[PDB]
Swiss-Prot record:
GO cellular component: cell surface; extracellular region; type III protein secretion system complex
Signal peptide range in chain numbering: none
Function: Component of the type III secretion system (T3SS), also called injectisome, which is used to inject bacterial effector proteins into eukaryotic host cells. MxiH/SctF forms the external needle filament that protrudes from the bacterial surface. During infection, can induce innate immune responses. The needle proteins interact with host TLR2 or TLR4, and induce signaling by NF-kappa-B and/or AP-1. This activation is MyD88 dependent and results in increased expression of cytokines, including TNF-alpha, IL-6 and IL-8.
Cellular compartments annotated: Secreted; Cell surface
Top-rank taxon: Bacteria
Protein name from the UniProt record: Type 3 secretion system needle filament protein
Organism: Shigella flexneri
Family per record: Belongs to the SctF family.
Subunit record text: The core secretion machinery of the T3SS is composed of approximately 20 different proteins, including cytoplasmic components, a base, an export apparatus and a needle. This subunit polymerizes and forms the helical needle filament. Interacts with the needle tip protein IpaD/SctA. Interacts with the export apparatus components SpaP/SctR, SpaQ/SctS and SpaR/SctT.
Length: 62
């Protein structure tokens, strides 16, 4: 049950709904939101490393 694989499945289904009814602005917004959610997921991974670097910086300043 991989997370990024699941998010991609949700993205595919959102694209599918939009593809069938492209004049529905709500389906467009939902696809956009899902796509952003995927990018936020990647930003969160680099954010953890950034936190660790900050922790190390604090450790050095004793
Ligand atoms: Na979600």
């Amino acid at each position: 049950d991989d997370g990024t694989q699941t998010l991609q499945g949700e993205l595919t289904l959102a694209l599918d709904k939009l593809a069938k009814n492209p004049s529905n602005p709500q389906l467009l917004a939902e696809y956009q939101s899902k796509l952003s959610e995927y990018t936020l997921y990647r930003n969160a991974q680099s954010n953890t490393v950034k936190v660790i670097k900050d922790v190390d910086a604090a450790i050095l300043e004793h």
